[PDB]
Write a structure and sequence with these properties.
The structure is cut from a larger assembly and holds chains A (512 residues), B (507 residues) and C (516 residues). With 512 residues, chain A is of the alpha/beta class. Chain A is built from 17 helices and 16 strands. Chain A has a 4-stranded antiparallel beta sheet. A 4-stranded parallel beta sheet of chain A has the order 9-8-7-10, with helices on one face. Chain A is elongated, with a radius of gyration of 29 Å. Among the domains of chain B are: 74 residues, TCP-1-like chaperonin intermediate domain (GROEL, domain 2); 184 residues, GroEL. Chain B has a 3-stranded antiparallel beta sheet with strand order 3-13-16, sandwiched between helices. Chain B has a 3-stranded mixed beta sheet with strand order 4-12-5, covered by helices on one side. In chain B, strands 6-11-10 form a 3-stranded antiparallel beta sheet. The two termini of chain B are 23 Å apart. Chain C is an alpha+beta fold and 516 residues long. Chain C has 3 domains: 246 residues, GroEL-like equatorial domain (GROEL, domain 1), CATH 1.10.560.10; 102 residues, no CATH class; 162 residues, GroEL. Chain C contains 17 helices and 16 strands. In chain C, helix 12 runs antiparallel to helix 13. The radius of gyration of chain C is 29 Å and the shape is elongated. Classes of the chains: A alpha/beta (512), B mainly alpha (507), C alpha+beta (516). Chains in contact: A-B, A-C. Chains A and B meet through helix 3, helix 5, helix 8, helix 10 and helix 17 of A and strand 1, helix 9 and helix 10 of B. Strand 16 of chain A pairs parallel with strand 1 of chain B, so a sheet runs across the interface. Chain C: One of its GO terms (biological process) is protein stabilization. Chain C: One of its GO terms (molecular function) is ATP-dependent protein folding chaperone.
Chain lengths: 512, 507, 516
C-alpha cells in the first residue's frame, strides 16, 4: 500500500499533472503540433485534438486520472478549447509549487483561485459584444463559425459545413428560447462522397433503399406503415433456415405464396397505407404487385433504426398483419430517395416539411479518417452556435481575453488584504501561459510576443487585442473576425480552477 | 509489556493520520481505490476506514468504536478517532518512564465522568429563548451552515426550504428520508421543493395527448415488466417452413405482451409504473382505455415510493392486485425546467420527500448536496435536544481549563494523566485551524486565554481567522452527543492501554 | 531543442553557488534574527549576529559566490550598514533569474531589464522618502541615537551620538560640503575611566610616549615626517669594521655619533622641532644614541606609528613622508602650536598635540573606559553612527525601517511592468517578487508568519503609504513613523545598486577556466 504525507505528497502530485501539462502544451491552437496515437489494434492516428489525447492517454498515475474526467463534461460544455484547460490547469500548479515553499496551505490556494476566478469572469462580461441582438438571421451566424473550422481538414469546404451547422441548430431550437438542445442533432457517417455532399435532413435518415428501383422516388403522402415483417409470405427475423420436408410439401408452399402474395398486398390499400417500412426485404413477386397500386416500401431495414423512424414520425410498430389500421400509421411531409450520381446509395430520406425538433447531419467523404475529422469539427461547431444563441455576447478569442483577465486580476490584487493575494498574483501569471504557448507553437519568442500585446492594451489603447497566431497581417483579431464564445471563456477558467481545487484538497493516495 | 504498548500507540496514530485532515466541514478529501480500480473520493472519516480494511489487530479496536459512533449518530466519528489517538500520544512519554498502564485507565475513567458533570452543568436549554418563533431559530442555525459558499447570495431562499422539509415530516426524523435531486440549468432561486416522492422521469416514449396527469386517489402499480415489443424479456419466434404458421407466430408475439397487459387493467392500476422501459406499442393500449403509463423509474426512487404510498414492489404481473396497490391524495405533474416530473403528494405514509436543485453547473449542486446534509442534522438535533453547547471546538476548550484546574487538586499519579487529558482535547480545534488553512498558533493561543478572561462559548471561527462566540453565532452542537463521543474515546483508549502483550495462534 | 553545447548549465552552478551563501546568512537578518556559530580548525568557537563577520569566515572557493564577499565589502565603505540585506537581495535575484532562464530568455536581456528596474526603483524611493535638514544637528542627533538604541551599546548611545555630529560638523560644513571622509576621525582608547568622558580634540592624539626624550614639550613645533631610520651604519653587503687596538674601538664609538649628529644637524637647519618615524620592525628604526642628540636639539621622539594613522596625520597638519635624509627639506614639514604628552588616570599615555594651523579638516574623539568591550563596543557605535550621518550627507532623505521601503518598491514596480514591452515585463515583475523575501524574512525572524505579514502590508501601502512596516520592538505590524525607527536612503540605494550590478555581472558569465 502507498503512503506519502507532507509537502512531498503535494509536489509529487504537481509533477504528476505537469507531465500531462507539457504533453498537451504543444497541440494548443491552430499551430498546435499534432500527436501520433497508436491504438490497441495497431492502427496509427495523427491529430491535435485535446479531447482525443486524454481519451487515449493511459497514464497509471491517479493524479493524471483526474484530468481524464475533466474532459468528459468539457466536450459538451466547450468542445473547442479542450487543450486550453489542461495548460491552464497545469500552469496553476507550476506556480503553486512556489507558493507551497513559501509556507501556504493548499486550501488557502484553493480559496484564492476561486477569488481570482470571479475577478476574471466579471471582466469577461465587460469586454463582451452582442452579435444577434434582436435580429433573427443567419448571415453573421454562418460567417463567425466559418473561421473556427480552419484548424481541421474541412478547410476545402469550411464554407459549406458552416451553413449546414447553422441550419441544423436553428431547426431543433428557436432563437427566442435561448435553449439550444444538442441532443436533437444526430451525427452519422458513410465511406464515400466528399465534404460538399453533407446533407441536412429535418427528420430521420438511414442507409437503406426501396424494394424495387421503379418505386416512386417521391412519397408526398403521410402514410408510413412500420411493420416487423414484409407484405409477402412471412419469414423470421434472425435467420430463415429454410428446409423442405418432401416434394408433396414443396408444391403446397407455392399455393401458399399465391394466396399470401394476394392477401397481404391488397391489405395495404384497405388501410390506406402507401409506404410500408419493414424489417426484412421483399420478394420479386411482392414488388410487381405494389407497382400496380403505387405503394412504396423499404427493404432490409435494421431493428433499432426502425425505432428511430417512429420517434421522428410519431408512428407505431405494427408487429402483425391482423391489426393493420390507420392509427398505427406514421406521419411525415415527404419521404424521398437521394442517389448521389453514380455512387449507388439510394438512401431513405424521411422529412417533415416543417420546423421539426429532430435533424440528422449525414456527413460524406472519400475517406473514413477525413469524415472522422469533420465529426469533431462539426460537434465542436455546435458548441459555438449553442452558446451564441444562449449568449449573443462574445469576446475576442485567440489569446486576447486571457491577457485582459490577467490585468483585471492584477489590478484587483492590491485591494484584497488577505493571504490569498499571492494566489491572485499566481493566477494572473498562469493565465498568460495559454497565449504564451501559442507564441511557442507558432515558432516565435514566447516572451517577446506576450508582452508586446500587454503594452498595447495599456499604452496604445484600452480595448484588448489578439495575438497573430496564424501569421496574418497584424494584431487586433477583431479585424480578423476570430471570436470564440463567452460561455466557453468562462467555463475554461471554471473547470480548470475546479480541477485544481480538487487536487489541492488531496494530500494522500492509498490503494491495496 | 512496555514495548508492545508503544507498538499499539503508533499503530493507532497512522489510523488517525488517515483521517486527520477530515475534521470539520471544510476538511480535505482523499482518494482510495479498490481492487476493481473504482475511484472513491470523500471527506467523511467513517467512509475512509470502511474501505481501508486495515488488517492490523490494534488498529481494528478503533474501527469498532467508530462504527458504533456511526450507527448511533452517523456523524462525528472522526472526533472519536483523533481524540482516542491523542490520549495515547500524550501518555506515550509517561508509558516508557515506568508508569503502569492500568493507572492510566483509572485516570481516563476519572476525567471522562468529570467531563459529563461539566457538560451538563454548562449546556444551555434553548426552546423559546429571546421570545423568537422556532421557525426563525431553526432558520438562523441553518443559514449559518450555508454561508461562505457558492449560494451565499441566495442562502435565505434555501434556508427556508429546510425548515419546510422537516416540519412536513412527523416527529420521527431521518436524514435519508429527504432525497435531493440534481438538475442542471436555471438559476439558484428557481430550486423547487416537493413534499412527496419524485423521479427524473426519463420516459420519452409515445403516449401523447392522453394519460391525464391528474388523479383523485390513484392506485400506484409497481411492476418490473418490460412492455416493449422487441423486448429482451418478451418475444416469439418459431422457425418453420409453413407459411400459414407464421401468421399465428406474429400473433403470438403480440399476445404475450397483450395478455400480460390485460392483467394490468383487470387489477385496477390507474398509474402504472415500471422500472424497465415500455415501448410505444404498449403505451397506446394504456391510452385507449384512459390509463396513465410512465416507466423508466429508477429502483431507488420506487423504494421511497414504497415507503410513501404504502404498497409493495412486485416483479411478476400476475400477482398484481389490491394488496400491493398504494394510494395518495394529490398526484400531479410539473414542468420544472421544461422536463417532465411525476410525483405523489399527500400519501398516507408520506415520510419521505424530494428536493430538486437548480444551477448552471454540475459542481454547484455538488457543494450544495454536501451542505444540506449538515443543515438538516442541526435542525434534527436542535429539536431533539434543546440543551446544547457551542460548536466549532468550543466545548473542547472548556474541559481543558476545568479538567486541568481539577487535576491541580488531585494528588497522586492521576494528576499528570488527567492533566494530559486536558492537552489531548486540543486536537479538535487545532485541526479546524489546519483543515481550514488558518494559523493554529495564533488561534489556540488567543482562544485558550479568552476562557480565563471570562470566555465560556468562544471557539474557532471557520469563516474568518479569529475567535468568535459560536453560541451567539448559532453554531451549536449537541451536549449529549459530545458526551457519547468522549465516553467512546475513553473506552477506545482504555482498551488499548489495557493491552500489554500480543498473543497470536500460529497458523 | 537539442542544445549540445551547454553554457547555460554552467550558469546554474554559478547560481546555486551564490544561492548557498545568501541562504546561510538569511536567518541572521535584523536585530531579532538568529545567531550563527563559527568554529575554527583549532577549536576556537564564537557566536555572533554581525552580518559582516559571517561571510568573511566562510572561505568561499566558487568564483560565482566569491563575488558576494566583495559585494559586502563594497557596502562597508559606501553605506556602512545593512550588509546582511545586500546578499539576500543578490541571492534572491538569482533564484528569480532561474525561473526566467527556464523560459528561454538570454542573461543579457535580463541584465538590461534590471537596469531599467534599478533606475525606476531609485525614483520610487526618492520621492516617497522624507527630506531632512542636513544643517540641523538636531535631526542628525535623533536619527543617529534611535538607530543605536536597538544595537548592543544603547545606554551610552545618548552620549556618543552628539560626538559624531559635532565631529562631522567640525570637519564637514553645514549643508555645503557633500564629501565626507571617516579617515579624518581618530578614536583612541585607553584603560581607566568611562565612556562618559569624551574629548573632541581638533589636533592629533597618539598612543605613543615621548620617552626617552627628556624634553616632553615643544613650543612652536614644525612637525616633519621622516621614514628614514636614524641609527648606526647598517650596510646589507659584506662589511667589516677596522679595529686595530682598544683605541680604535673608541674611535668607532665617537665616529658613530658623528654619523648621527651630522644627520640631526641637517634637520635642525630647516627649523624642524618634532619628528615622526614610521613603524618598522625589520631593522633599527631609532638607536639609543639618537634619543639623546635630539634632546640637545630639543626634538621629541615619536615612533611605532602604523601606516593607517599616517594618512590621518597627513591631512591633520599637511605632512609628507621623507624616505631619505639627503632629500629632506623644509617643504615636507607640518605645523603645531603646542605639543606634549597628557597622561591622565584613565586617558593613559597620550600625545596631545593641538593647534594644526594648516590646511586640513581632522578631529579626534578620545573615549576612555575600564574594560575592553566597554571601549571596543563603544567604538563600533561611533562608526555605526558616523556612517548613518555620512549616508545622510550624500542623500538628504529618510525612509521607514523594518523593510518598509522594500514593499513600496515591489508594489509600484509591479504596475510599472504593465506599461513595458519586450522581455522587460517578466524581468521587472521577477525583480519585484525577489524583494518580498526581506520582509518575509524579518516576519519569520520576529516569530510571525512569513507571508501573512508581507501580504497585508502590500495593501496597507496601496491604500495608504509606506509608513506602515514591520516593528521588531513590539513584534508586529505597526506605523513605524510613529515608532520613530528610520534609516538613511543611501543604505537602500547602494544595497540595490551594488547588488543588482553584481547579479548582472554573474549573468554575463558563460564559462570560467583556470589559468596558470
Amino acid at each position: 500500500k502507498s503512503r506519502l504525507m507532507g509537502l512531498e505528497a503535494l509536489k509529487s502530485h504537481i509533477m504528476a499533472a505537469k507531465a500531462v501539462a507539457n504533453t498537451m502544451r504543444t497541440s494548443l491552437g491552430p499551430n498546435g503540433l499534432d500527436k501520433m496515437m497508436v491504438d490497441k489494434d495497431g492502427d496509427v492516428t495523427v491529430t491535435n485534438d485535446g479531447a482525443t489525447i486524454l481519451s487515449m492517454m493511459d497514464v497509471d498515475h491517479q493524479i493524471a486520472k483526474l484530468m481524464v474526467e475533466l474532459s468528459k463534461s468539457q466536450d459538451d460544455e466547450i468542445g473547442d478549447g479542450t487543450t486550453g484547460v489542461v495548460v491552464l490547469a497545469g500552469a496553476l500548479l507550476e506556480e503553486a509549487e512556489q507558493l507551497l515553499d513559501r509556507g501556504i496551505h493548499p486550501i488557502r490556494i484553493a480559496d484564492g483561485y476561486e477569488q481570482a476566478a470571479r475577478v476574471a469572469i466579471e471582466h469577461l462580461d465587460k469586454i463582451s459584444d452582442s452579435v444577434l441582438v434582436d435580429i433573427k438571421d443567419t448571415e453573421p451566424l454562418i460567417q463567425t463559425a466559418k473561421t473556427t473550422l480552419g484548424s481541421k481538414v474541412v478547410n476545402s469546404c469550411h464554407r459549406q459545413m458552416a451553413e449546414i451547422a447553422v441550419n441544423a441548430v436553428l431547426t431543433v431550437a428557436d432563437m427566442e428560447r435561448r435553449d439550444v438542445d444538442f441532443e436533437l442533432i444526430k451525427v452519422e457517417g458513410k465511406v464515400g462522397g466528399r465534404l460538399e455532399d453533407t446533407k441536412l435532413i429535418k427528420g430521420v435518415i438511414v442507409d437503406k433503399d426501396f424494394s424495387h428501383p421503379q418505386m416512386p422516388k417521391k412519397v408526398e403522402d403521410a402514410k408510413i406503415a412500420i411493420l416487423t415483417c414484409p407484405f409477402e409470405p412471412p419469414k423470421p427475423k434472425t435467420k430463415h433456415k429454410l428446409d423442405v420436408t418432401s416434394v408433396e410439401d414443396y408444391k403446397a408452399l407455392q399455393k401458399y405464396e399465391k394466396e399470401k402474395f394476394e392477401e397481404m398486398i391488397q391489405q395495404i390499400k384497405e388501410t390506406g397505407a402507401n409506404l410500408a417500412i419493414c424489417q426484412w426485404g421483399f420478394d420479386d413477386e411482392a414488388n410487381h404487385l405494389l407497382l400496380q397500386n403505387n405503394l412504396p416500401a423499404v427493404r432490409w431495414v435494421g431493428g433499432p433504426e426502425i425505432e428511430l423512424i417512429a420517434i421522428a414520425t410519431g408512428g407505431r410498430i405494427v408487429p402483425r398483419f391482423s391489426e393493420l389500421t390507420a392509427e398505427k400509421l406514421g406521419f411525415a411531409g415527404l419521404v424521398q430517395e437521394i442517389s448521389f450520381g453514380t455512387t449507388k446509395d439510394k438512401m431513405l430520406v424521411i422529412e417533415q416539411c416543417k420546423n421539426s425538433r429532430a435533424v440528422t447531419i449525414f456527413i460524406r467523404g472519400g475517406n473514413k479518417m477525413i469524415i472522422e475529422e469533420a465529426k469533431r469539427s462539426l460537434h465542436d461547431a455546435l458548441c459555438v452556435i449553442r452558446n451564441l444563441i444562449r449568449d449573443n455576447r462574445v469576446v475576442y478569442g485567440g489569446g486576447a481575453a486571457e491577457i485582459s483577465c490577467a490585468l483585471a486580476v492584477s489590478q484587483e490584487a492590491d485591494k484584497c488584504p488577505t493571504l490569498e493575494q499571492y494566489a491572485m498574483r499566481a493566477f494572473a501569471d498562469a493565465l498568460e501561459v495559454i497565449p504564451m504557448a501559442l507564441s511557442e507553437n507558432s515558432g516565435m519568442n514566447p516572451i517577446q510576443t506576450m508582452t508586446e500585446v500587454r503594452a498595447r492594451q495599456v499604452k496604445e489603447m484600452n480595448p484588448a487585442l489578439g495575438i497573430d497566431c496564424l501569421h496574418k497581417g497584424t494584431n487586433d483579431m477583431k479585424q480578423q473576425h476570430v471570436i470564440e464564445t463567452l460561455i466557453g471563456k468562462k467555463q475554461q477558467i471554471s473547470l480548470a480552477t475546479q480541477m485544481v481545487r480538487m487536487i489541492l484538497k488531496i494530500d494522500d493516495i492509498r490503494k491495496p | 509489556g512496555i514495548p508492545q504498548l508503544v507498538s499499539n500507540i503508533s499503530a493507532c496514530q497512522v489510523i488517525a493520520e488517515a483521517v486527520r485532515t477530515t475534521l470539520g466541514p471544510r476538511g480535505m478529501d482523499k482518494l482510495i481505490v479498490d481492487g476493481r480500480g473504482k475511484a472513491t473520493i470523500s471527506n467523511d472519516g467513517a467512509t475512509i476506514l470502511k474501505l481501508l480494511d486495515v488488517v492490523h489487530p490494534a488498529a481494528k479496536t478503533l474501527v469498532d468504536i467508530a462504527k458504533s459512533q456511526d450507527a448511533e449518530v452517523g456523524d462525528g466519528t472522526t472526533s472519536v478517532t483523533l481524540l482516542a489517538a491523542e490520549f495515547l500520544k500524550q501518555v506515550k512519554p509517561y508509558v516508557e518512564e515506568g508508569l503502569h498502564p492500568q493507572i492510566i485507565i483509572r485516570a481516563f475513567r476519572t476525567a471522562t465522568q468529570l467531563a459529563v458533570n461539566k457538560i451538563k452543568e454548562i449546556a444551555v436549554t434553548v426552546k423559546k429563548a429571546d421570545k423568537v418563533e422556532q421557525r426563525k431559530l431553526l432558520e438562523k442555525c441553518a443559514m449559518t451552515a450555508l454561508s461562505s459558499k457558492l449560494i451565499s447570495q441566495q442562502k435565505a431562499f434555501f434556508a427556508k426550504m429546510v425548515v419546510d422539509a422537516v416540519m412536513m415530516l412527523d416527529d420521527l426524523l431521518q436524514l435519508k428520508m429527504i432525497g435531493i435531486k440534481k438538475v442542471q440549468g436555471g438559476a439558484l432561486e428557481d430550486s423547487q421543493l416537493v413534499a412527496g416522492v419524485a423521479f427524473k422521469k426519463t420516459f420519452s416514449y409515445a403516449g401523447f395527448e392522453m394519460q391525464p396527469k391528474k388523479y383523485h386517489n390513484p392506485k400506484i402499480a409497481l411492476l418490473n415488466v418490460e412492455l416493449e415489443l422487441k423486448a429482451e424479456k418478451d418475444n416469439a419466434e418459431i422457425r418453420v417452413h409453413t407459411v400459414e404458421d407464421y401468421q399465428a407466430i406474429v400473433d403470438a408475439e403480440w399476445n404475450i405482451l397483450y395478455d400480460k397487459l390485460e392483467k394490468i387493467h383487470h387489477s385496477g392500476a390507474k398509474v402504472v409504473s415500471s422500472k424497465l422501459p415500455i415501448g410505444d406499442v404498449a403505451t397506446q393500449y394504456f391510452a385507449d382505455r384512459d390509463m396513465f403509463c410512465a416507466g423508466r423509474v429508477p429502483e431507488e426512487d420506487l423504494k421511497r415510493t414504497m415507503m410513501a404510498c404504502g404498497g409493495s414492489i412486485q416483479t411478476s404481473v400476475n400477482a398484481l392486485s389490491a394488496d400491493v396497490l398504494g394510494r395518495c391524495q394529490v398526484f400531479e405533474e410539473t414542468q420544472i425546467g421544461g422536463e417532465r416530473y411525476n410525483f405523489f403528494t399527500g400519501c398516507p405514509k408520506a415520510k419521505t420527500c424530494t428536493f430538486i436543485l437548480r444551477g448552471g453547473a454540475e459542481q454547484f449542486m455538488e457543494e450544495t448536496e454536501r451542505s444540506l446534509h449538515d443543515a438538516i442534522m442541526i435542525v434534527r438535533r436542535a429539536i431533539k435536544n434543546d440543551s446544547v453547547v457551542a460548536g466549532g471546538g468550543a466545548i473542547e476548550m472548556e474541559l481543558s481549563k476545568y479538567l486541568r484546574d481539577y487535576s491541580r487538586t488531585i494528588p497522586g499519579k492521576q494528576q499528570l494523566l488527567i492533566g494530559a487529558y486536558a492537552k489531548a482535547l486540543e486536537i479538535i480545534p487545532r485541526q479546524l485551524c489546519d483543515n481550514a488553512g488558518f494559523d493554529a498558533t495564533n488561534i489556540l493561543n488567543k482562544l485558550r486565554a479568552r476562557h480565563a478572561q471570562g470566555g465560556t462559548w468562544y471557539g474557532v471561527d471557520i469563516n474568518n481567522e479569529d475567535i468568535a462566540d459560536n453560541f451567539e453565532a448559532f453554531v451549536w452542537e449537541p451536549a449529549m452527543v459530545r458526551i457519547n463521543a468522549l465516553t467512546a474515546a475513553s473506552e477506545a483508549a482504555c482498551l488499548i492501554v489495557s493491552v500489554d502483550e500480543t498473543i497470536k495462534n500460529p497458523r | 531543442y537539442q542544445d549540445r553545447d551547454k553554457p547555460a548549465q554552467i550558469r546554474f552552478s554559478n547560481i546555486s553557488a551564490a544561492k548557498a551563501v545568501a541562504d546561510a546568512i538569511r536567518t541572521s537578518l535584523g536585530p531579532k534574527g538568529m545567531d550563527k556559530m563559527i568554529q575554527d580548525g583549532k577549536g576556537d568557537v564564537t557566536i555572533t549576529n554581525d552580518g559582516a563577520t559571517i561571510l568573511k569566515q566562510m572561505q568561499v572557493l566558487h568564483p560565482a559566490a566569491r563575488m558576494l564577499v566583495e559585494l559586502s565589502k563594497a557596502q562597508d565603505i559606501e553605506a556602512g550598514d545593512g550588509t546582511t540585506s545586500v546578499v539576500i537581495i543578490a541571492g534572491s535575484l538569482l533564484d528569480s533569474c532561474t525561473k526566467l532562464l527556464q523560459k528561454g530568455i538570454h542573461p543579457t536581456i535580463i541584465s538590461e531589464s534590471f537596469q531599467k528596474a534599478l533606475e525606476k526603483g531609485i525614483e520610487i524611493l526618492t520621492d516617497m522618502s522624507r527630506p531632512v535638514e542636513l544643517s540641523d544637528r538636531e535631526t542628525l542627533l535623533n536619527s543617529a541615537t534611535t538607530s543605536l538604541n536597538s544595537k548592543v551599546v544603547s545606554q551610552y548611545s545618548s552620549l556618543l551620538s552628539p560626538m559624531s555630529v559635532n565631529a562631522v560638523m567640525k570637519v564637514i560644513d553645514p549643508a555645503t560640503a557633500t564629501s565626507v571622509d571617516l579617515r579624518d576621525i581618530k578614536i583612541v582608547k585607553k584603560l581607566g575611566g568611562t565612556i562618559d568622558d569624551c574629548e573632541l580634540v581638533e589636533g592629533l592624539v597618539l598612543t605613543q610616549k615621548v620617552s626617552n626624550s627628556g624634553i616632553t614639550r615643544v613650543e612652536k613645533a614644525k612637525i616633519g615626517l621622516i621614514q628614514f631610520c636614524l641609527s648606526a651604519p647598517k650596510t646589507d653587503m659584506d662589511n667589516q669594521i677596522v679595529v686595530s687596538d682598544y683605541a680604535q674601538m673608541d674611535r668607532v664609538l665617537r665616529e658613530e655619533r658623528a654619523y648621527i649628529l651630522n644627520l640631526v644637524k641637517q634637520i635642525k637647519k630647516t627649523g624642524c622641532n618634532v619628528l615622526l618615524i614610521q613603524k618598522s620592525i625589520l631593522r633599527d628604526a631609532l638607536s639609543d644614541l639618537a634619543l639623546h642628540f635630539l634632546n640637545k636639539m630639543k626634538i621629541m621622539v615619536i615612533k611605532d606609528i602604523e601606516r593607517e594613522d599616517i594618512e590621518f596625520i597627513c591631512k591633520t597638519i599637511g605632512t609628507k613622508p621623507v624616505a631619505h635624509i639627503d632629500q629632506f627639506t623644509a617643504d615636507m614639514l607640518g605645523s603645531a602650536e603646542l605639543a606634549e604628552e597628557v597622561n591622565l588616570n584613565g586617558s593613559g599615555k597620550l600625545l596631545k598635540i593641538t593647534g594644526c594651523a594648516s590646511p586640513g579638516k581632522t578631529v579626534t574623539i578620545v573615549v576612555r573606559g575600564s574594560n575592553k568591550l566597554v571601549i571596543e563596543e563603544a567604538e563600533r557605535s561611533i562608526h555605526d553612527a558616523l556612517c548613518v550621518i555620512r549616508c545622510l550627507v550624500k542623500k538628504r532623505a529618510l525612509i521607514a525601517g523594518g523593510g518598509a521601503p522594500e514593499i513600496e518598491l515591489a508594489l509600484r514596480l509591479t504596475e510599472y511592468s504593465r506599461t513595458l514591452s519586450g522581455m522587460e515585463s517578466y524581468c521587472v515583475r521577477a525583480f519585484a517578487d525577489a524583494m518580498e523575501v526581506i520582509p518575509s524574512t524579518l516576519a519569520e525572524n520576529a516569530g510571525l508568519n512569513p507571508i501573512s505579514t508581507v501580504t497585508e502590508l502590500r495593501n496597507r501601502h496601496a491604500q495608504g503609504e509606506k509608513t506602515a512596516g514591520i516593528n521588531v520592538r513590539k513584534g508586529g505590524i505597526s506605523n513605524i513613523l510613529e515608532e520613530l525607527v528610520v534609516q538613511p536612503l543611501l543604505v537602500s540605494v547602494s544595497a540595490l545598486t551594488l547588488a543588482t550590478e553584481t547579479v548582472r555581472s554573474i549573468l554575463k558569465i558563460d564559462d570560467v577556466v583556470n589559468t596558470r
